[PDB]
């Protein structure tokens, strides 16, 4: 068995902007799951944007992101959230959150060491 | 002293309602440390809150607040700020901002490793 992600929350936005992203767990315990989010801007690579231990308690960020993003948890509810402040065009992307058991301690930065992903939410920034 | 800190932001809420505090500084600012914040109420013991990073790419959480609060830094204001969600009459204490020079590792949870602090802002929480 796996873990189900479903991102949600994108669209278009304007410059400046405010947008909160969120993901839903299913199939399978998602305190069990320290979780990413990722972003692939359009011809680029997938990049790691930032991580949240299994209980909410450490959040680590990309230095593109740090300062404007905040990411959180509620296990209550199967959802991590990735709220995103400042946007600017740089920010469009398709982004993804992902899922992996904390037994290793790992680079979190490196979509390698992550073992189930979401379908991804596109957001558009103008 | 090298840094003074003064927060401010504290009042009297209902349970379930919000507030932001913030931390200002005089002397040198606050892009020169690592920043923690702790509460106490009294016949308590101090409490450890929120830990943020020198570079702000990390943050660290007590358990009796992950998920609710949220410590970040914007270091062109030179504020610290602490938004406390879904507060609890257990929240109710004198909360202070503290200052680290981030030269070493050390246990970023314990108050005895910081060097600097606030006078503190009463929250009360009904």
Do not use: H
Request: hydrophobic content about 35%; some cysteine.
């Amino acid at each position: 068995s796996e873990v189900q992600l479903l991102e949600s929350g994108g669209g278009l936005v304007q410059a400046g902007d405010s947008l909160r992203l969120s993901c839903a767990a299913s199939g399978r315990t998602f305190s069990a799951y320290a979780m990413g989010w990722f972003r692939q801007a359009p011809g680029k690579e997938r990049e790691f944007v930032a991580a949240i231990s299994w209980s909410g308690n450490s959040t680590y960020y990309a230095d593109s992101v740090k300062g404007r993003f905040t990411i959180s948890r509620d296990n209550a509810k199967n959802t991590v959230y990735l709220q995103m402040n400042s946007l600017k065009p740089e920010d469009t992307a398709i982004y993804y959150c992902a899922a992996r058991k904390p037994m290793y301690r790992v680079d979190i930065s490196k979509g390698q060491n992550y073992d189930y992903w979401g379908q991804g939410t596109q957001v558009t920034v103008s």
